[PDB]
Amino acid sequence: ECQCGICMEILVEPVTLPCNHTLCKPCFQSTVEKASLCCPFCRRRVSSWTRYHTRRNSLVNVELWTIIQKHYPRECKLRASGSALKRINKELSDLARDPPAQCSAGPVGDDMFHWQATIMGPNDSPYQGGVFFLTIHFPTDYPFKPPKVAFTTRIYHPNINSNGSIKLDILRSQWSPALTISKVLLSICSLLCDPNPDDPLVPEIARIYKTDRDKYNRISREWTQKYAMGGSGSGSRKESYSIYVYKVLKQVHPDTGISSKAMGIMNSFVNDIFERIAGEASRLAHYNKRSTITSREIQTAVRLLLPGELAKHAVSEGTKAVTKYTSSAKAKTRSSRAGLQFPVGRVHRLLRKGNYSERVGAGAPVYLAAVLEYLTAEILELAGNAARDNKKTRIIPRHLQLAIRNDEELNKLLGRVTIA
Numbered sequence: 001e002c003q004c005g006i007c008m009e010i011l012v013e014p015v016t017l018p019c020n021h022t023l024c025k026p027c028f029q030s031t032v033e034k035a036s037l038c039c040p041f042c043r044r045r046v047s048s049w050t051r052y053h054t055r056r057n058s059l060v061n062v063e064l065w066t067i068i069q070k071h072y073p074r075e076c077k078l079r080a081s082g083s084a085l086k087r088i089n090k091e092l093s094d095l096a097r098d099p100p101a102q103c104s105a106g107p108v109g110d111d112m113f114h115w116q117a118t119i120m121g122p123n124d125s126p127y128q129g130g131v132f133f134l135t136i137h138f139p140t141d142y143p144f145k146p147p148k149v150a151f152t153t154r155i156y157h158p159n160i161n162s163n164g165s166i167k168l169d170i171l172r173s174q175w176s177p178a179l180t181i182s183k184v185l186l187s188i189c190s191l192l193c194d195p196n197p198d199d200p201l202v203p204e205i206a207r208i209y210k211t212d213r214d215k216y217n218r219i220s221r222e223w224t225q226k227y228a229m230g231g232s233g234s235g236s237r238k239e240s241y242s243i244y245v246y247k248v249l250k251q252v253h254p255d256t257g258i259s260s261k262a263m264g265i266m267n268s269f270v271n272d273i274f275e276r277i278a279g280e281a282s283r284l285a286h287y288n289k290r291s292t293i294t295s296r297e298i299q300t301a302v303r304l305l306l307p308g309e310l311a312k313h314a315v316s317e318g319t320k321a322v323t324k325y326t327s328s329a330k331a332k333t334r335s336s337r338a339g340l341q342f343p344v345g346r347v348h349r350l351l352r353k354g355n356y357s358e359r360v361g362a363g364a365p366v367y368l369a370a371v372l373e374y375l376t377a378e379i380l381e382l383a384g385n386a387a388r389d390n391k392k393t394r395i396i397p398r399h400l401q402l403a404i405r406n407d408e409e410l411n412k413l414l415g416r417v418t419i420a
């Protein structure tokens, strides 16, 4: 609990500066002794203090060091043996440990430096009942530089403008590494309950808030209604498509099996293709200020990321799936309605879960599921062919690597994925 405000790892050889900020010795030497010679929290000069004590081996607060060592030895010894990414990874764990009320945030797909966040309109405030989405961008120098935070949902606030920019001291001048994204999100919640009209970002809204509060409250609720009516993230657990890879392998090679080690690689392929297409689809949606990812954003992602004929075929399979899905009967399952083996409803959840956008249309998961199915069928067809070469009836990792390397286009697509 008595943690280092920089790295969020248990204080080892804590160093307490004259300003009485404390940071573990590793953080101190890297950020104060090696270059800055200033406190990373309040920026007070500690040059004279650092040189006087480094010569006498008296940087560590012995009293503080002995207490945490006896009380919490396991974490001191675990730690004993980049910084931005790890700090961001520790933030996500902190968010899961003490989830901030009315708030949630998580990375966009597998990109840790780009998060999505939701803020429920605080209770008894004119934004109550609305869900407000925000975009968070962690800089290279995190936590030494602030995170870029902005609203993507329009809101009526004296300190929030049409760009989604948030005028809030801790986001810039008063930012400190000791702050966490959870603390930042809770400060935004307070700002919604108690605007700061005397330091406005939108003077008109501040003047109305200062001279006609009834008006301000009315317009805030109308805006909350018109525009405001985002989770842990993708998580660390690896999804699997074994059920559906098996189904496709049966269609393509009914007399050929696939080993357990090979199936894990197939999952890796499918998960990698999902992440890349959805990630690009997320970029396009944000680029064009669209709240919903649809079949259009998925297609353009496939057109750009897939090579040559794979892209053309995948685009065809995705277009035919959506077309068949729109004309199908409403009663059957979504996968059945699109004529696919891969799970449409499940792909939609994973698209929603990955924080790729505020909303996800019904055509997107159909188009993406059909693309995943097609690419899976191509890999399995070639992998099965590769196995038949070696006089084998069961696909193994070696046959998967062969099929990818022997196909120019698939090698371009999956060559970077590691096969053991």
Ligand SMILES: [Zn+2]
Pocket (backbone or CB within 6 Å): 004, 005, 006, 007, 008, 009, 023, 024, 026, 027, 028
């Ligand atoms: Zn530290």
Ligand SMILES: [Zn+2]
Pocket (backbone or CB within 6 Å): 017, 019, 020, 021, 039, 040, 041, 042, 043, 044
């Ligand atoms: Zn300080």
